[PDB]
Amino acid sequence: PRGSHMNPKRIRALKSGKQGDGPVVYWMSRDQRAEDNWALLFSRAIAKEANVPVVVVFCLTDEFLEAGIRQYEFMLKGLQELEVSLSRKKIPSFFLRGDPGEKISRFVKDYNAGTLVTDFSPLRIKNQWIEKVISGISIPFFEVDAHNVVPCWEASQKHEYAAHTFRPKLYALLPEFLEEFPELEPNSVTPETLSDVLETGVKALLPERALLKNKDPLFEPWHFEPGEKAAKKVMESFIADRLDSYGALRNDPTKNMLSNLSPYLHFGQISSQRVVLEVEKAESNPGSKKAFLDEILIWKEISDNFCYYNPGYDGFESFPSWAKESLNAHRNDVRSHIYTLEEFEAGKTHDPLWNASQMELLSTGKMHGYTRMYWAKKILEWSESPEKALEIAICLNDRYELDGRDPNGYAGIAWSIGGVHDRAWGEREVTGKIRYMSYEGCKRKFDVKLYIEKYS
DNA sequence: CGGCTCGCGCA
DNA sequence: TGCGCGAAGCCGAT
Ligand SMILES: Cc1cc2nc3c(=O)[nH]c(=O)nc-3n(C[C@H](O)[C@H](O)[C@H](O)COP(=O)(O)OP(=O)(O)OC[C@H]3O[C@@H](n4cnc5c(N)ncnc54)[C@H](O)[C@@H]3O)c2cc1C
């Protein structure tokens, strides 16, 4: 649908129709940014061809009640900044509260929209809302993958068993799909308060807040400033100060050598494609660059692959057959310890390294990547059953990670507990052939005592 | 058949 | 710390 720097393979039709006479509406969901946003760029291009303005609509759902203030504030502060950015480009934004299935349909009717565009998420609930909207509108409806460098449905047509099978397919398509972004052109044709939504939601969540004994909150909000501008600064300092040592130190949780981009990536406050462009152009240790690109291209995009092609991505049934057979055989094994959700949540296990990982999670909202593996694997080892382990890990990941409620989290938990995108290892009690990680193993790789002391 | 994102013994 | 091996099941290139 027109454009020159616009690859049509990024866009797909959800519903055909007579293009209406009214504005193009971008139903923003996953990609909460004005810059480097293929969904917003395609929306603007369609609007230009039809000689109509583009408007942005965002629907605040009751979903926020299932997480905490830490995510709600991060997201909403981002959106306050986004509202201003879009304003400068003469793009109005509308913030709706309620079920997207109902509210988006109504908005399209009331505002006499000509075309509807949304960004891409493989999570189940987004597909449900889309199907509801389709039944409620008579205008064309498109979806743009603004989150992946290679559109999810282009990179592969099936569930990929392993990174080693996906890697060649993805890297083959980078020359086509890794490109610079055109600038967002302001609107030429002229056309609820977020402050109030924020106060109302916070009041609702205050009773569920994570607290220490003295009733002082556990969460430290100053580690990550929200919004598009801050995200760019974190990217720049990563490339300048941390990228060089990333390959060597990414698996040492006592060193702050990660990008720290995940909260921003999760809410779409920065484009993965932008990050890849800048890292590609940086002159740094080649090994570090390859390690980083493999994480933000292969592992991030295969997580969308996993959720898109396996709608039971958060269930035991999505595990590979060998892992299901192994875990099933060990269901009756005596566990060395059994903890409840509440005991894991409070960091009251016998294992100080596990407890310190959980304390980093509670206090910062971002557990170091290496201890996330250890953390999830011990939940399998010290729970009543594989289903209960899965349920506990997802519950804590999604409640406390700023970057949670994400394909990466479901794929990472499924790797840790069910061997998805892994292979079988030595046979053990309880965990069977699922890859094992030990306290002693961690001791030989990094200064465990220092991580424990940092987080009590 | 070859090669896949641990623990372990050994410089 | 850095290396090379062991223990495991399967994909996919033929
Ligand atoms: C049990 C478990 C739970 C996880 N929970 C989440 C989660 O809720 N949300 C989430 O986005 N990631 C999650 N991760 C994946 C990974 O730990 C985080 O993306 C990463 O630690 C975020 O830190 P960073 O951006 O500073 O990392 P960097 O090392 O700088 O990583 C760069 C980027 O690469 C991608 N990436 C890196 N590691 C992985 C990985 N294992 N899998 C997928 N993509 C990866 C992410 O987009 C990440 O932000 C989880 C992993 C596991 C094993």
TrEMBL record:
It catalyses: cyclobutadipyrimidine (in DNA) = 2 pyrimidine residues (in DNA). Its EC number is 4.1.99.3. Its cofactor is FAD; coenzyme F420-(gamma-Glu)n. GO terms for molecular function: deoxyribodipyrimidine photo-lyase activity; DNA binding. Residues 22-152 form the Photolyase/cryptochrome alpha/beta domain. InterPro entries: Crypto/Photolyase_FAD-like_sf, Crypto/Photolyase_N_sf, DNA_photolyase_2, DNA_photolyase_N, Photolyase_Class-2, Rossmann-like_a/b/a_fold. Pfam families: DNA_photolyase (PF00875). Keywords: Chromophore, DNA damage, DNA repair, DNA-binding, FAD, Flavoprotein, Lyase. PROSITE patterns: PHR_CRY_ALPHA_BETA (PS51645). GO terms for biological process: photoreactive repair; UV protection. Belongs to the DNA photolyase class-2 family. This is Deoxyribodipyrimidine photo-lyase. The lineage of its organism: Archaea, Methanobacteriati, Methanobacteriota, Stenosarchaea group, Methanomicrobia.
